[PDB]
Amino acid sequence: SQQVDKIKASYPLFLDQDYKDMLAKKRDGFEEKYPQDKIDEVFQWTTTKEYQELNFQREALTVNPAKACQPLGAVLCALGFEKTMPYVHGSQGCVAYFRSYFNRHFREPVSCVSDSMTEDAAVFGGQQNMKDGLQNCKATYKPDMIAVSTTCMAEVIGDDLNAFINNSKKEGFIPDEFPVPFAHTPAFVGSHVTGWDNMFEGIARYFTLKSMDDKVVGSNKKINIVPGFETYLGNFRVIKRMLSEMGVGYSLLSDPEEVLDTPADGQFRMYAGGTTQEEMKDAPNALNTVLLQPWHLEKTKKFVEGTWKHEVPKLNIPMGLDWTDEFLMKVSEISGQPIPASLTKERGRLVDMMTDSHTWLHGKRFALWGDPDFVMGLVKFLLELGCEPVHILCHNGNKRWKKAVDAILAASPYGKNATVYIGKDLWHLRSLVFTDKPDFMIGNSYGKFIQRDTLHKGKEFEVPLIRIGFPIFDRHHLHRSTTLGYEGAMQILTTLVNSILERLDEETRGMQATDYNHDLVR
Amino acid sequence: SQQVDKIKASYPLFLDQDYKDMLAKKRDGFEEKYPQDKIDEVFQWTTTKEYQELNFQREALTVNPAKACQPLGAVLCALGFEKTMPYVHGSQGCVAYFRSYFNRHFREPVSCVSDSMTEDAAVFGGQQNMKDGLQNCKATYKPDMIAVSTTCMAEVIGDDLNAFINNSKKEGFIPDEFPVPFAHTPAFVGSHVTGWDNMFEGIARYFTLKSMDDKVVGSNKKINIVPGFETYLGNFRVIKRMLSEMGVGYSLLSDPEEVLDTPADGQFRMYAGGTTQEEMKDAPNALNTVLLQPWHLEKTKKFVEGTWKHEVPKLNIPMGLDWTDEFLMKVSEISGQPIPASLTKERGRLVDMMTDSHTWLHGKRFALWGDPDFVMGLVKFLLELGCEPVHILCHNGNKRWKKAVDAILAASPYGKNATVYIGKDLWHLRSLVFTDKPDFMIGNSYGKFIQRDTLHKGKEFEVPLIRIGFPIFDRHHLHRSTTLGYEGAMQILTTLVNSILERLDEETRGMQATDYNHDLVR
Amino acid sequence: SREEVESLIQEVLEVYPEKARKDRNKHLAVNDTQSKKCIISNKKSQPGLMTIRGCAYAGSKGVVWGPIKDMIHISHGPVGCGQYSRAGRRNYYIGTTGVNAFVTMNFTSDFQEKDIVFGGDKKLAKLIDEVETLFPLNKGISVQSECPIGLIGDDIESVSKVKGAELSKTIVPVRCEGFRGVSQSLGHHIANDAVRDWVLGKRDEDTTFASTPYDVAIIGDYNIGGDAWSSRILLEEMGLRCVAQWSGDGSISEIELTPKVKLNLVHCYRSMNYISRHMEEKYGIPWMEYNFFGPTKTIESLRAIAAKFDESIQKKCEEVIAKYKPEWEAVVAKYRPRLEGKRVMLYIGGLRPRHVIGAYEDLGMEVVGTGYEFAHNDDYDRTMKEMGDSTLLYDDVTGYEFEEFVKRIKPDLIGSGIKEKFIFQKMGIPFREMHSWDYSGPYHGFDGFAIFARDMDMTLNNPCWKKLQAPWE
Amino acid sequence: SREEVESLIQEVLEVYPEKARKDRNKHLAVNKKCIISNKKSQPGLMTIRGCAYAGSKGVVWGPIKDMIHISHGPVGCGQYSRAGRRNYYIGTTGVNAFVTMNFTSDFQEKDIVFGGDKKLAKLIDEVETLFPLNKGISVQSECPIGLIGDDIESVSKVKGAELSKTIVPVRCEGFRGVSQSLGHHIANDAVRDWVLGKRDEDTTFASTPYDVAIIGDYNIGGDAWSSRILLEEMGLRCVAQWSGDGSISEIELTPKVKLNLVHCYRSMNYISRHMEEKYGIPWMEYNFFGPTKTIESLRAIAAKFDESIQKKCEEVIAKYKPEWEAVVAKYRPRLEGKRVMLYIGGLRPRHVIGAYEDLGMEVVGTGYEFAHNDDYDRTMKEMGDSTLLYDDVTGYEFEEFVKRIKPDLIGSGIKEKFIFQKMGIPFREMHSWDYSGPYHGFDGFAIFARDMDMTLNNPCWKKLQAPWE
């Protein structure tokens, strides 16, 4: 039933007595449910060390992954270029999912197309899809550029992306001068971030490999900045803001912050901002190229060093206090520009915030997951704050990275109870947070089911989630935040300190039970 | 007892059994405590409409005020001037309290002094305190200026500040050229925002009243901005950022954002930044003066109109969409600068955010409190978002203000269930949220004790707090936030939408009970 | 409108190249009885034109099998498909996730290139065993193939027989490779056939279930936001016994019991008419379509369903009608005035483009355009009657097409999916999500109609829509 | 070195005018006939000191949990002191306890003109209808009450008799005294004249030979609950706690006890002296900061009783030994050699010195806001040779002493904290314990050690210097 002055949605409508009894009758009549004492028993078992051993013995089953497939990153890389359309050679279902996955994180239109390969294309490949693809997309959505990646069907049947595109130009479906950079992006290798790297290196070479005789390192007095797979719009904006404040000439290669943030003003803008094809042609004339997320930009690096001849500096992601510092000093050297007063003050304001909040941050234990550059940033800054990163899980991480993180962990007292897991997923993480309970998790929305399971064991066992990362689907507008730079650090610090205080407020709200400690001043 | 590898603080230390039995022994033996069922009975009763009628019949007793004394704002105003020491003529206790109340909100040093009047000054007056206090202040802390207000002691006995200062210059304690603006700031009149107005008019008079002869409205092609009592560093910055984006020459008269945010770099800076004595002396040559918080700047307005001959525009506080638009359009007419594209875009992003979050905000019911301009700005923005400001409380409001708020509410479908209360306190508000339960409160840290009371009645009766205002003592760094302009509106919208989604997550985390509606996507 | 509609259609198609303009023209029509004379459908998508459609894996894993709560469903392939579709569909269920229900989890074989090379069949059998030690209370296993499984010649049907026999478990192979068919639609048929061959027969001999003359099954209600619980409760207040819910909140045992029922209630024709035809041939059980969207359609469907039984169910039907009548009339009285006259364009998948029309009309709105992503001609035959004359019909609408139609027609509200939402919000047009219900609902039944009406009202009349244009212009 | 310290004091006093320079010179020393104390503050110099209202309402009366305390006067005073002091209690705030509420008469000009006494009587009645389970009312006078000639004692008597309720008038006006100090004395006298005697004729309380009252522990952080536990494991019976987590009834039973355990001499020695005069109850000072002082205290307290209590004392000492030695084992290495400059109120600048030394730290400078020369006499014995002593320190002075001495750790108040963090000196709050605590007893020593360590060795301090500076 409903009272029209207070309509109830599914929660709490289905808690009304009549619904609760129906569901009881449904279950007892026809579901053949396992008894509740057997369910509680199996649940208790799934929180135990014995279950964790079996769990970590898995080799063929993956449960709750913390990664996506390569072409999701190829899309986001190409969305970063001016009036370019992401185009994914293969089956159309993948594009429907890429679009959706990004619509719900950014809450924004995300344009991508497919050439709708099907059963028949399996037999003789997708050449005709591509010819008609490019012509149709070009005529209909009017891009200056179309950037091509592949779904797993395309990869497996062995389509030649280079040959099909050329033939589409030879057969006159698209103008020859029309740019169609491309990359192979197979879902069964690496992850969404790899697809970013592969697509980036695709577009760098398209605009550059054949034109190098003309180029002179440093002649354009700018610094190239390659950001990688990046889902926070404040991360593009902080980088641009700090370089401008120091007066460094920079080209940010792959810049989606305009297209993922258009204004609602009566009209739908398919394309906006982005790296010009021209900044790409002239990128080899820069002083150097800085890779903001080196641990998923290996292929790009080999190209900018091999072909552009840049001496790419060994910089970590500029997260937290030390790595931001080192990034600015490296930029200062390359460019000849001093670090200005405004950034020196902002550093000192971050350090001040660290001094004001250290007593609530000290010894707080964290389980955390994500992509490898972002997770090692978090590890580094958490250590700088005096927090203990206990569980560090990177599903798409590798041995070489894990060694770097373990080196970082050993250079600090706060990393000594910490362990790094590569190749493990969120069902492994579930066990770790039951058997070796941290105080919080830091991660993406999928961690809400781990929080829920831990509460089911008890309120004393609950591990509250702090949403940082990708994707974030159950809160609005966090995609606008920042995690890099002194600003990003100020944001992460504020968010952790207040998660801690909010949790403490909740545990001490009980009147005449725990409220002796419900302090007005914390 | 304590285990050295996991030390316990008061929470949860005192929940150990032996402490538990000791507290029960203490109570039963010696407290003569009313029995628990009587305590329950009185608590229940304090939640009822009957209790609420008694509560609103109060007229001598105030319980949990939502306001402070005038001299607290005279201090904050004076802190906004360059190398200025705030100086409170009267008793030292008040200054100890001002300093700690601000220290705890801004987590920064707060410089202010007293002239330590005691019992023997009550009988013969504080003339000697003023003579010694200024000479000691000026020699020890070396301010370029000293700004004098009063403790309620100094007011009651009738000290003449104009006279005592003139004597101090005549008798050579401070130079004659040394600026010593002054203002009476009686604690038993108005509130802390009245002190801000009083002090500000004080300083303006000191630097301009006798010097009008040469002044020409408009000659300096600038707009003066008077901010009023402001405890968000973000609100100074957004105002300056938007006027610089528009290319508008502007003089922010009283600007503390530097003194309240000095870097931690190895040295203490008592003074930093602030409105220059040159700026105040030149202020009459502005085209006009804008008052950001008109409802506590009545006295300033009269002086700027009366002596400066500025035609102060009728603007609301620039909070929310409609009022930020009115502010920028007024600024544009006065200055002749067109509103730039960057700001038109930011507006469009604010509307986008509202359009992406309307489903979750719509009809959500709030209680809120604070200073008059701040509260009507909150009210306005809730109405634009489709929320219902049910209980609006302004302890330091007045009948004229209430009539302006009641008109705003009447102009909107979402004001139909809203009532505005002036001269009521947070013990009154506590009854309103028992008897006419909102979904949330928006206020300062004192509302945390109402949330606590609501939960004791029951988890279905809990009203969760959203901390916006002053003071905020139990979370860190929120003083860095923004609440004016589009930026501020985007911050508030984000906080509100995500506080609604945090609450729904908590209500639906119960495994097999409510987690049918624990959606990954919201 | 009539000649202006057929005009509009020709202006939009002017942009395309020749081959696609001539295909797309056959998938746009203006309404005036047999769709095989008006519009063509269920045909492949024109490459590169930004269709909304998904794949057969979405159709089988995402829509048909994934909701079945006490089975574990393996996404067999690379890590992409299972991730993008984890918990993106709100097929609600009661259960203890990770212990005895598993709908919002993502089980997957995470194919690497080695598995592409040697085959993933030995990986599958190893993963079936790990599933067994770690999730001991699962009641069966489905293996939903992703694009690569077929293309490399694996044989999941043999892994299923052998592992199924070895452990005495149901393991259902489903060959829902994304490249099969043209849309989610084939996913529905592949999945239905998989249920027939591997599940539905499991109790043909068994007769230990006690039947009654009033046993029914709800077929194709995936309980979005509880939509199907809002339907069951009415059916049981009418005297009936819902022995099974396919697949919203459905248990594998409820599916094995459906051949015992006396009548198959089919909400989503498109996705489940296959299995319903089969259950009529083999078991003799009749089926009918129904529509619980809005009180007019809901009332008509109760009365039609009670007419298949005796008086007592017919008596109870009238008692249900009269109980809830004051409730939806209070809903109408409150929201019809705020929504009457407003014009809606719909673009959804296979059923709602026609089935929700009655609930808009009950609030006094007018559906001026609708379209389906992957419907068949029998869906369009049913739609012709629900739509008014000279309304615009569009099949597998492209992104350009939908944007250009909306600019000319200027609906007051658009109802479509996530990929379309932020497009029209930017343009200033109230949008409501008609798949996820915009995280609201249910919309089925009387209790659902109060929520639908409150939802359409809150979005259409929200203050944000008056603010799109800065006062300086 | 003594003379290197004696020239730091002279160099700093060079900035002052002559009147203030000659007065400040007597309030700074390198260690009775050594330093002056408890004098009026020099105008203009930014002292840390509060008023007699803070010392009466904020420290002595406020914690008493079942009474309602009225801030009589304008809104400011009660508002700044709402919940700022962590005097912990067990209770149901708003019905039977009221510590973190702010009751006030909210004086407007009308009351400054016609008086506030009719308003006060109306407020008493309103408090009675809205808070039925209160067990008494206190009225705490802000600066204006005295100065306009109100008569709160008459209102208190008249209304008290009318309603049969304890209503305690307190003239703690902020202009009286020179500091919080006078507020302590005024508050004690108020207790004496209006509460303490309520049960002089009553004889139904069942005594024992082990009864005891804790005097002057305000239960900051729980400090006094972690002291009660030890006293009671020793076999004693703590009949009352003053004023932390205290109830009026516990106050009224204090004259029935065998011994008064004074923690805070400064704030409560007044009442203790009175209970010895009138009721014959001896008193003694004790110190529960750190294990050395807590052991030495337990043993001295136990010695005022029989062999039974003396045994149990040794069972308590031996129970907790493994725990505090573990604390030292873990934290003395991380904190040994570090120097500390302290500035607090009336007691902790000397009482906490034993705890620092147990962790191997050296207190090189200490001082009080409002101590008397009897407090300083006690301090001489606790402080080392040639350390620095400062009374009613000025902001300028405390900043300048810190710059030359360069302590490793400073402990003072909120008004000082952010100043030195900026300078990059580890700072720990030694009034509010920085929201941590308790620090008294053995349980509190574990927290105190954990807290000095986390701050002194925190990674943040290594970062104040930009690598390009």
Ligand code: ICS
């Ligand atoms: S199953 Fe179909 S597209 Fe019939 S695949 Fe699709 S939960 Fe749609 S119009 Mo998402 S044929 Fe259901 C549908 Fe309708 S997933 Fe839901 S909304 S009634």
Ligand code: ICS
């Ligand atoms: S009462 Fe005194 S200033 Fe003895 S007024 Fe002050 S809770 Fe201090 S050094 Mo705040 S004589 Fe207590 C004190 Fe010491 S408030 Fe606390 S910390 S032990």
Ligand SMILES: [Fe+3]
């Ligand atoms: Fe958006």
Ligand SMILES: [Fe+3]
């Ligand atoms: Fe600070």
Ligand code: NA
């Ligand atoms: Na796919």
Ligand code: NA
């Ligand atoms: Na005062």
